[PDB]
Design a protein around this ligand. Structure first.
Ligand code: OGA
Ligand code: MG
Ligand code: NI
Ligand code: ZN
Length: 331
């Protein structure tokens, strides 16, 4: 068995190996990469996503989200308070202001210590979930707006043609902006490219151990757990590495820098934070190996998780028993 300790693997494809996206994912899996739940891919030195980032300031962040925490430093939830629209230039200036800017620090480890000690006492503003792309149309390799669609993968594997579309999303971050513990919708893969700015630290639980994290979360968030049998789908709960270690939960961590891709694998729980002003692009995707995970994925039917148009068909075809209840949740 390849990668039996479920370590995060880092890959350095050549420009020739960067041509065929599906083939390289399958290669990484042949080496055991999926067992960690997360892999890093450093593009060949010849590649670029676009020529420059000098002209992005006029992108609108229609609904910036203020991430307000409740709980204790290592075990907390966040809610998203909607703020007035602002441009990416306005948001960058806000991220760099004395109130929001990254503090002085020694290295990534010191900054991580400071994040876990102090996150809850601040409410950073995240420009998350913005439909769009920063890849140049002429970038032919690993262009997240030109991937094969999940609807096409389902049709190729299973024969059934379904409605829906699959497009990327931009994330503009600042110091302490946070992504809560989650897997993807329908336990899909995700791919995330850090276009510019400061790093993003990730935490991940191996897919084979995801239920260990769920059982801890039910213990740590007992009211949420009674409200919903899949409340991590709400994407609100944070648990620190120290708390994970105290409770014996297997996990790994890694920091992504500008110019690097991360892939999350089906049922790989992940969480993390931004070091300072940055911009990432991410999209979900599927492979043949995903289908079985999609058929078994949990679902939120309490009404909180509320998701995309395209998830309807995935539930309807892969989980017809659950369909009726799930759709009541969505309506
Ligand atoms: O970057 C973020 O805030 C969150 N991203 C993801 O969860 C992902 O790419 O799967
Ligand atoms: Mg612009
Ligand atoms: Ni994710
Ligand atoms: Zn729910």
């Amino acid at each position: 068995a390849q990668n039996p300790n479920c370590n995060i693997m880092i890959f350095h494809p050549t420009k020739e190996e960067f041509n065929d996206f599906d083939k390289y994912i399958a290669y990484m899996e042949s080496q055991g990469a999926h067992r960690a739940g997360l892999a890093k891919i450093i593009p060949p030195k010849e590649w670029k996503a676009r020529e420059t980032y000098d002209n992005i300031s006029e992108i609108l962040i229609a609904t910036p989200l203020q991430q307000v925490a409740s709980g204790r430093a290592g075990v907390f939830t966040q809610y998203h308070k909607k703020k007035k629209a602002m441009t990416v230039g306005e948001y960058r200036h806000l991220a760099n202001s004395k109130k929001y800017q990254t503090p002085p620090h020694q290295n990534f480890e010191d900054l991580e210590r400071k994040y876990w000690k102090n996150r809850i006492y601040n409410s950073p503003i995240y420009g998350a979930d913005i439909s769009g792309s920063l890849f140049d149309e002429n970038t032919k390799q690993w262009n997240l707006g030109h991937l094969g669609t999940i609807q096409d993968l389902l049709e190729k594997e299973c024969g059934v043609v379904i409605e829906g579309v699959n497009t990327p999303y931009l994330y503009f971050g600042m110091w302490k902006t946070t992504f809560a513990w989650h897997t993807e919708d329908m336990d899909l893969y995700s791919i995330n490219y850090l276009h510019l700015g400061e790093p993003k630290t990730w935490y991940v639980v191996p897919p084979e151990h995801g239920q260990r994290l769920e059982r801890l979360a039910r213990e740590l968030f007992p009211g949420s757990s009674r409200g919903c049998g899949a409340f991590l789908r709400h994407k609100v709960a944070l648990i620190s590495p120290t708390v994970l270690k105290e409770n014996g939960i297997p996990f790994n961590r890694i920091t992504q820098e500008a110019g690097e891709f991360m892939v999350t694998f089906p049922y790989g729980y992940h969480a993390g934070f931004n070091h300072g002003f940055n911009c990432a692009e991410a999209i979900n995707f599927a492979t043949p190996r995903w289908i079985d995970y999609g058929k078994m994925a949990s679902q939120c039917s309490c009404g909180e998780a509320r998701v995309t148009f395209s998830m309807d068909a995935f539930v309807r075809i892969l989980q017809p028993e659950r369909y009726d209840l799930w759709k009541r949740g969505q309506d």
